Design a protein around this motif. Structure first.
Motif, PDB file in Angstrom:
ATOM      1  N   UNK C 154       0.820  -1.201   0.000  1.00  0.00           N
ATOM      2  CA  UNK C 154       0.000   0.000   0.000  1.00  0.00           C
ATOM      3  C   UNK C 154       0.859   1.257   0.000  1.00  0.00           C
ATOM      4  N   UNK C 155       1.796   1.359   0.945  1.00  0.00           N
ATOM      5  CA  UNK C 155       2.544   2.603   1.121  1.00  0.00           C
ATOM      6  C   UNK C 155       3.420   2.901  -0.091  1.00  0.00           C
ATOM      7  N   UNK C 156       4.143   1.887  -0.576  1.00  0.00           N
ATOM      8  CA  UNK C 156       4.979   2.056  -1.761  1.00  0.00           C
ATOM      9  C   UNK C 156       4.154   2.477  -2.975  1.00  0.00           C
ATOM     10  N   UNK C 157       2.939   1.938  -3.111  1.00  0.00           N
ATOM     11  CA  UNK C 157       2.101   2.254  -4.264  1.00  0.00           C
ATOM     12  C   UNK C 157       1.428   3.611  -4.111  1.00  0.00           C
ATOM     13  N   UNK C 158       1.278   4.085  -2.873  1.00  0.00           N
ATOM     14  CA  UNK C 158       0.614   5.360  -2.633  1.00  0.00           C
ATOM     15  C   UNK C 158       1.577   6.534  -2.635  1.00  0.00           C
ATOM     16  N   UNK C 159       2.854   6.300  -2.339  1.00  0.00           N
ATOM     17  CA  UNK C 159       3.841   7.373  -2.376  1.00  0.00           C
ATOM     18  C   UNK C 159       4.593   7.330  -3.700  1.00  0.00           C
ATOM     19  N   UNK C 160       4.651   6.152  -4.315  1.00  0.00           N
ATOM     20  CA  UNK C 160       5.353   5.964  -5.572  1.00  0.00           C
ATOM     21  C   UNK C 160       4.765   4.769  -6.306  1.00  0.00           C
ATOM     22  N   UNK C 161       3.597   4.909  -6.939  1.00  0.00           N
ATOM     23  CA  UNK C 161       3.038   3.766  -7.685  1.00  0.00           C
ATOM     24  C   UNK C 161       4.011   3.177  -8.687  1.00  0.00           C
ATOM     25  N   UNK C 162       5.055   3.932  -9.045  1.00  0.00           N
ATOM     26  CA  UNK C 162       6.141   3.400  -9.862  1.00  0.00           C
ATOM     27  C   UNK C 162       6.650   2.071  -9.313  1.00  0.00           C
ATOM     28  N   UNK C 163       6.858   1.991  -7.998  1.00  0.00           N
ATOM     29  CA  UNK C 163       7.304   0.745  -7.400  1.00  0.00           C
ATOM     30  C   UNK C 163       6.297  -0.379  -7.526  1.00  0.00           C
ATOM     31  N   UNK C 164       5.001  -0.061  -7.474  1.00  0.00           N
ATOM     32  CA  UNK C 164       3.974  -1.092  -7.624  1.00  0.00           C
ATOM     33  C   UNK C 164       3.968  -1.639  -9.044  1.00  0.00           C
ATOM     34  N   UNK C 165       4.003  -0.752 -10.040  1.00  0.00           N
ATOM     35  CA  UNK C 165       4.017  -1.219 -11.424  1.00  0.00           C
ATOM     36  C   UNK C 165       5.304  -1.979 -11.733  1.00  0.00           C
ATOM     37  N   UNK C 166       6.436  -1.494 -11.218  1.00  0.00           N
ATOM     38  CA  UNK C 166       7.693  -2.211 -11.385  1.00  0.00           C
ATOM     39  C   UNK C 166       7.629  -3.592 -10.748  1.00  0.00           C
ATOM     40  N   UNK C 167       7.051  -3.687  -9.547  1.00  0.00           N
ATOM     41  CA  UNK C 167       6.916  -4.971  -8.872  1.00  0.00           C
ATOM     42  C   UNK C 167       6.025  -5.904  -9.676  1.00  0.00           C
ATOM     43  N   UNK C 168       4.954  -5.366 -10.257  1.00  0.00           N
ATOM     44  CA  UNK C 168       4.062  -6.205 -11.041  1.00  0.00           C
ATOM     45  C   UNK C 168       4.759  -6.732 -12.284  1.00  0.00           C
ATOM     46  N   UNK C 169       5.507  -5.880 -12.980  1.00  0.00           N
ATOM     47  CA  UNK C 169       6.228  -6.332 -14.165  1.00  0.00           C
ATOM     48  C   UNK C 169       7.285  -7.371 -13.807  1.00  0.00           C
ATOM     49  N   UNK C 170       8.080  -7.096 -12.772  1.00  0.00           N
ATOM     50  CA  UNK C 170       9.153  -8.010 -12.402  1.00  0.00           C
ATOM     51  C   UNK C 170       8.613  -9.345 -11.914  1.00  0.00           C
TER      52      UNK C 170
END
Lengths: 56, 49, 258
Positions: C154-170
């Motif tokens: 939640x926190x990583x995706x809310x302060x930097x959704x970049x990390x969420x999309x990167x995590x999903x791709x990886x």
């Protein structure tokens, strides 16, 4: 066939830009696959005239 | 399933590809993801039959 | 002599009581237990304060958020305290991982996820932890990243959704073009489950784990492979020639801080 064309919020993020709206793909399966995979180290090589058909 | 149970040749044409580009707005990597997915699903299912 | 015996009785009874309050701290006793950890000078024994916090967040998968609320209370006020605790949990996470200790890695990573959701841990170190978890994902490190993400997606995706999309791709590529089994397959499925569920099973911080205001907090960034230290030998006491001076000073700090 229902059309799904997703409104943007700002102009900013790119034209193609995965938005939360789409459901996250996460396609799952077994040990996914293997192919009739033509390994390199036999040989193949690109005469460096062509390009990915437009990168410019 | 029907084509397997009657043993025909098996051809597949994925169609309507603008629906990934103009309609879906899917960047190319995840586009490839979805394509690979359709392929792996149909292939696993033919493996089922 | 008398001053020596006094410092020794201080260390003994103080540390015992502070560890009691460490294991006692509740949510309907969050501010109460934190103000008792302040009524005792927790910074005089700052090392064993970090140690009680670490012990709780490690041996309790279900009181990591409570040790974390205590950490956030004491860390928006004395950031160096939660900072020693953070460097410690990084030491313990790299311990578990680089020594192949699933349980140690999981304990410290739950502590770091609680910190990231409380906003005492910065997002670049969370990114590095996810990345060193997913570099060569097998069952263990895949579950490690996914378990971290069970609460800190939640926190990583809310302060930097970049990390969420990167995590999903990886995650999708490492589990969808590679040789992993039903474990990491259903683990990626669970990851996507939380994602599509919109982090509704695990928001940032349940009622009472975040009450400190917007910029009145302290998210200090000490990363994973940065050669940080535990500085935990302060868990053993030390003689004090400036005991009276620093005592008046720190009691004045706790009086000025409430």
């Amino acid at each position: 066939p229902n059309v799904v064309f997703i409104k943007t919020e700002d102009p900013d993020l790119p034209a193609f830009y995965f938005d939360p709206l789409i459901n996250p793909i996460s396609h799952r399966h077994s040990v996914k696959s293997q192919e009739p995979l033509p390994d390199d180290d036999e040989e193949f090589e690109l005469p460096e005239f062509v390009e990915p058909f437009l990168k410019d | 399933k029907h084509a397997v149970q009657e043993r025909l040749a098996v051809t597949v044409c994925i169609n309507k590809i603008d629906r990934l580009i103009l309609e879906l707005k899917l960047p190319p990597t995840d586009a490839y993801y979805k394509l690979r997915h359709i392929v792996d699903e149909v292939n696993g299912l033919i493996s089922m039959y | 002599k008398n001053s020596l015996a006094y410092q020794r009785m201080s260390w003994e009874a103080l540390k015992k009581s502070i560890n009691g309050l460490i294991n006692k701290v509740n949510i309907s006793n969050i501010s109460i237990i934190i103000q008792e950890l302040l009524q005792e000078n927790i910074v005089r024994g700052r090392g064993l304060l970090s140690r009680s916090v670490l012990q709780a967040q490690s041996a309790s998968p279900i009181f990591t958020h409570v040790y974390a609320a205590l950490v956030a209370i004491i860390n928006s006020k004395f950031p160096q305290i939660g900072e020693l605790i953070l460097k410690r949990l990084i030491l313990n996470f790299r311990k578990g991982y680089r020594r192949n200790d699933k349980q140690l890695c999981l304990t410290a990573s739950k502590f770091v996820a609680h910190l990231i959701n409380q906003n005492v841990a910065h997002e670049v170190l969370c990114l590095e932890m996810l990345t060193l978890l997913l570099e060569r994902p097998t069952d263990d490190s895949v579950e490690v990243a996914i378990g971290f993400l069970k609460e800190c997606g939640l926190k990583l995706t809310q302060v930097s959704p970049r990390g969420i999309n990167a995590i999903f791709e990886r995650l999708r590529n490492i589990l969808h073009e590679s040789e992993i089994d039903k474990r990491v397959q259903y683990m990626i499925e669970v990851m996507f489950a939380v994602r599509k569920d919109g982090f509704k099973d695990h928001p940032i911080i349940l009622e009472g784990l975040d009450l400190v205001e917007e910029d009145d907090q302290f998210t200090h960034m000490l990363p994973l492979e940065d050669d940080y230290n535990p500085e935990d030998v302060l868990n053993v006491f030390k003689m004090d020639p400036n005991f009276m001076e620093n005592e008046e000073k720190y009691k004045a700090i706790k009086k000025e801080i409430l």
